[PDB]
Design a binder for these strands. Sequence first.
DNA 1: CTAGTTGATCTCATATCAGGAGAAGGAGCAGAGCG
Lengths: 1096, 365, 252
Amino acid sequence: MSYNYVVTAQKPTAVNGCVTGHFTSAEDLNLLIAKNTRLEIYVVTAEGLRPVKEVGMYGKIAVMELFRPKGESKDLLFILTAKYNACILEYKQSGESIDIITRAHGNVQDRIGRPSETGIIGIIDPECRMIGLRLYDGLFKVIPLDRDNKELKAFNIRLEELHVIDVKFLYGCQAPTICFVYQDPQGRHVKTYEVSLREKEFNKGPWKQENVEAEASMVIAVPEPFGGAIIIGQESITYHNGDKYLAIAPPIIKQSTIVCHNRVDPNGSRYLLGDMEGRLFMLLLEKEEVTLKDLRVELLGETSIAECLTYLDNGVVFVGSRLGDSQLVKLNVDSNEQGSYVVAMETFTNLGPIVDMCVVDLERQGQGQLVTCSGAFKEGSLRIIRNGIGIHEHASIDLPGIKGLWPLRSDPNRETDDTLVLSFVGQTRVLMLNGEEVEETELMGFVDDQQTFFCGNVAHQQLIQITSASVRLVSQEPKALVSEWKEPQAKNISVASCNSSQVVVAVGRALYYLQIHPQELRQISHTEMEHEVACLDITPLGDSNGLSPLCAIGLWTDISARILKLPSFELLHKEMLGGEIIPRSILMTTFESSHYLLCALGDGALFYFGLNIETGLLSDRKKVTLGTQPTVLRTFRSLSTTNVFACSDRPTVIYSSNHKLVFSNVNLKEVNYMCPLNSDGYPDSLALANNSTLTIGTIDEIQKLHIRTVPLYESPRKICYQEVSQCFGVLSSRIEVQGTTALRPSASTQALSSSVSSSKLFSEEVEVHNLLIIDQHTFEVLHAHQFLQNEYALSLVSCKLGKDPNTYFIVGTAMVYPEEAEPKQGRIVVFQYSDGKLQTVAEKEVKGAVYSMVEFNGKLLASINSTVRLYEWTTEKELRTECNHYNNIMALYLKTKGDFILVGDLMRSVLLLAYKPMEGNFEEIARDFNPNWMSAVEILDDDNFLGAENAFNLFVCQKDSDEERQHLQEVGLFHLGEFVNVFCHGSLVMPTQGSVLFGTVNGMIGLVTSLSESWYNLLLDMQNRLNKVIKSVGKIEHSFWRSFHTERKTEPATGFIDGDLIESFLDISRPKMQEVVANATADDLIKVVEELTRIH
Amino acid sequence: MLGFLSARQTGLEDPLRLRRAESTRRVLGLELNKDRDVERIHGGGINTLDIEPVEGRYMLSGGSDGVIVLYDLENSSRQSYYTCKAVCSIGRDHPDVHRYSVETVQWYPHDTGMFTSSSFDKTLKVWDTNTLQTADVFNFEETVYSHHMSPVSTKHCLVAVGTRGPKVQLCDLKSGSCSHILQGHRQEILAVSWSPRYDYILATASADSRVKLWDVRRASGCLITLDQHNGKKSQAVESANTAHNGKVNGLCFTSDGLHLLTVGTDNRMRLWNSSNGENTLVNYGKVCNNSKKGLKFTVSCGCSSEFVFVPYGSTIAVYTVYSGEQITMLKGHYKTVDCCVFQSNFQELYSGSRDCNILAWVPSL
Amino acid sequence: DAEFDEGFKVPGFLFKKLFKYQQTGVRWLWELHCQQAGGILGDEMGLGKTIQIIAFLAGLSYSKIRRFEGLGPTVIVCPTTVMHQWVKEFHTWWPPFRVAILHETGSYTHKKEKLIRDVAHCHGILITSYSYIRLMQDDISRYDWHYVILDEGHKIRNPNAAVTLACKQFRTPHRIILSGSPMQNNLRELWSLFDFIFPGKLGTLPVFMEQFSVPITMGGYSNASPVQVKTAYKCACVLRDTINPYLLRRMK
DNA sequence: CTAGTTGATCTCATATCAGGAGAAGGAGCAGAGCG
């Protein structure tokens, strides 16, 4: 058996469905977005969207509709999963806590049935008397709702029309009436049935069948004043109410088919319609007294290619795209002088269909960096993805041995931090940093003979300084020191803390509380505590008055984070931490919900607790180990919120997203100290002090994965990296219509240089395929080599062949003519990139599409339609066949390791081929004889072959252990839920063996790695217990979710660890964790799960 | 195909699209593969073939010579040309070999370890594949034309057996009860087929020109009697309500079990609504059968459009189930074709015939 | 109210009155009703089998399961000596059943054919004697009876008697027998009873005899060859498991 | 009109050599066409 660990590096980003309604509360307007397995609940504010919850379904969300049963206060959510788990979910918020309770659940799969072509349709009666599901041909599954089920017992009604295109429930009908477009051999017709829940059968509909357009594909039920339906077809929009039959054939909608629609109003006087090109139309119903007088369609503008779109309010439309970035657009009443009313407000990153990718160690670091062909037709792009915050440094000053950083506004009028005070060993150094100029000057009011433990700007246009002996309150406006407080015993200050109003200093084992007032430093609260002081923070949070009411301390020999009551310095709460290393940093900070207290040790351990403004009680202890060196915490307010920064040998920016704390890495060497800085020239900038210098950089976003976007405006298909040439070869495809004309300026049409394929070998809308050479620094299209008319560039490999030293871009193509089903012609072109031009070094006309190429020990291994052949690169610079293998249906995927070739077939699924070099021919080592339709293949080890099935499954074949030795054994099975397009070795970061990344159609980037048997057994047992503890949203079983699933097979997973489920082990409270770890201690498993999370 | 690959790769089309479309294309391109052979072991005509439902690797074959052959359909050799070798065989020297023609053979659904076979020697034998020995024998008072185990019933393991008697025998392989009889037919039952959808729905076709759907739980006779006309010629049911104008010698539920295909010696194939037995009026043209015994024909599975492969004399006629359009005639046999069986994993067909051959039809390219 | 798997709401204020075996018997009867098959309540005397029948039919009427909105017309064929008892039992358990006796004593005081027509027209509960089934065997079997309960169904023990033929001339799937002993002398009686409740389950009586009765009795003698006794044991096991889901018999 | 009693009437159990003469079927077979 094989042991594999799958984890999600990037959650899916493609939006397959969105609905709006009052889900989170009766007064709120929610936007619920289904990304493949993630459900995102947003609240539609007057500006943007404020996320409230993001839950992960154990299922691909196929249907998602909000409905309000009689008596319900707020909307319930119906979700159907691709595996046919139906659930009705309610949002129950109990104060701070947010829950998604499963009001009902079930599994609605018929044991047999032809899953319908058009796909799962799920509709709800507008009076919530039933949910209709069209899952299979010839059946219409009904889940009644007036009968309060908890199991959603569903019954089939035999639907005599076997090919139903779309169906909706009509409005204003005494009984639940479905209206559906169906296809029979005589054409497409719209028919209506009334569903009788008591007779559990259909009845004659209100209005007879009507013969409609040949491609009538969408039905829109129109609300109560009008009723009836609007059938959208390819060329016409028709309206039916039983006697009224309006029809328009707007020429403007003929260019592309309308694929999503949405009702802007409640009475349906206006509909948004999105087509496959990204146009957005408004369909208007003009009423007459009420009946409907006439229909109008007008083109609002352009958006991302919408899968779904939702009208929120005030003209704001959420454009849900599977192929591009989703957009949040606005509808203005008037045009923008270019004919468009659509104005994009926001763009949500979507690594669209990741069709190919490479991990390049670009920037010559030790870190991989994915470069993905993301997106599609108009939305095509290259996305560059790395696990780093991105220092983005602008200046530096070489100042050795820094021990302090604080921003200062030396100029009184300016509110900007245009000065920095620094402490090194025993003195104070001021820096002016005026604009971009940086210099070392002395500021009035600061002692240069004593160290600065702390200093900062305070209220009353005042500064304050805490040195090792005294505290000096600098009156910036009038003159030098006027208020100074000195410890009565002339004891040195061991720790300091201060905010905009007050002060707390530690002298030995005693604490002093000082409050800053104009020309006054008044001591109020004082005590001499049990042990020495270690670290402090009194930063007010949610201040609202001018003073913080609480205090946080760290003590010696009783290693613990204590809390104190500020006016009296009594002991509020104690959490014991332990260890032989004293606390170093203590900070309290708001993270998106409430107050958290962050305390760190000298070994990189760091503890975050949930703190309250009344009691000051630390709850939900969770511990996280970052770094191997002491840490300090500094707070900086970015655009969105406060993002605390952790300074250590492993600098790490801490903030919280979606009401959970996460640790984003910063990828420089080391950071002793940091402080925020917003100078006239440096906005929201940082100042990272290390042992040597002070780097002054900003950080772009802190999302763990930084995603650059290189818009191509054309569908990219393949990508390979040529290091010697410092470029990416990207096969792209753009759609031109007519001789031919580009519909838009794509990256291929806007290259520096260009060229066209002039080949002597072979003698509506069409796809033009190009080879783009893209600079790997600036990502500009250095060159665009257009391929022949009707030539599809499929594969692209970069390699050096034979013995010549040149590195070649080798493209495999096929000739596509509409008269044929399989290319009979194709060619392999060898290009060399030099002098900014792309010369054609060689060609080889082959007799099929070259679906895949891999360079194979200096030889070229191509897979023409069903044959896999090996080419040799002769000294003459031409490709010469060496050996063939013909035993394939269609060799689509090829991988290589040494002498072994893994051939993924279209439907025979893997064949381990070996090139036996002494003879010069291939030999079938083994084959997996199951009929798995491949989407990709990979080689993990000398004897493990990963494959991705087209039904969203991963399987691992293994060379077994006579003729039964020719049977590869599927030792691993796992339902991923994503359609994997690419595997590739590499990892995005600097216990587990190997690392294979993969990209999916939905934008998931996942990572497969091998575990050992010991680790695998341990984690499988934990996996079972987390299933016993974690409660899934639809009460779906994890085992069922990860069960290998195909229409003719279903097995429980095996040999695979869902790393996602394991890594959820950190997101649970201590009692539940203790329940998980019944039969070694929990902190040990934290060691394991942390070490596991580091691999991605 | 490249458009299909790109649409699958970019998510425009569900992968179900590529599976069903390409499977349909392969079925339309189904052609006699001389690049594959089945080892000739039957001295007489092959009456029946049955590929196992799970893993589709092994096939059974019963001949008129009374022998059973168990073939391997996987290319275990590294060449592109191979012969489907005969793994096992109940030959003339096996002590339990059938004395007369093996008319039907069926793998036990849910597992490959057991299979049952019926003969004109008035026996339904249950064989343990591993030991290749009979585990049970059901003797009947009259020769068996067809037997069938429900492909779907996880609960009951009844074998519906149609013999020359007017009654349909139900034999429980779970502890042995071959007493239950479904009465209501008037002549030999030439075909029996359990619904793939409902555990307890059994369709039985007889030489009295009637097809009846039974609910074997029910104690009150047939659910429905198939009627050619649906009521245009209506009579008090004593002789009317015939499914065909001759003997009905073949039954086959469509893949989803929502329709039933019956072929009769009136040279017609009809498609019926399996819930209310209503003729769908699909034409199918003329389907030549003059078989005096059960005619085993199959349907396709997992394609965009369903197909039916019916023995048409010496050929296999391929039709679209829901439109009647004859796709094609596969012509490679020398005598009448008795049975065809569909390998749904690769859209392959195997057809046996009275010429003592089993021909594999593989998709071309 | 107690609820079964598909939904059969036997009322709580009746279901609570039954004993555990009685509730098991009601469950078994309703499983038969779902399978649309008949059975034999072969529980010996004194356990109470009428209580089970009225409880099950009352639940089937209140539950409104459906053909017929709830329970349709049912005929109970019992010996004369218990007919009045039956009506009283109904009237004390489930009053709203319009129960009526077909007898010379009776209460109709008009033509008996009119009584059959009127009772069937109201989906009533009609009680007869076996003799009336035999005599009016053509008349009484025209009104689409939904249930047939042969109380003391061992009157059907002879597959030749005219009462057996008249009782097997009913058409409903629902045939229940309340007999303290399904068989009394030999297996002829078991075959006759099973031919009543389920026409097809056991084979034609020749087949049944030649397979079961002769081997069992031949293995019931102590001078039988070992093969004979082993075959008798096997055939008895086959008959037992064949009749297992349709004969509910409980001892003391 | 109403029971109650009393015969008839019917159903269901439990036993194990000194004929002859003609007509119709059938079988062996010779021979003639004839594909």
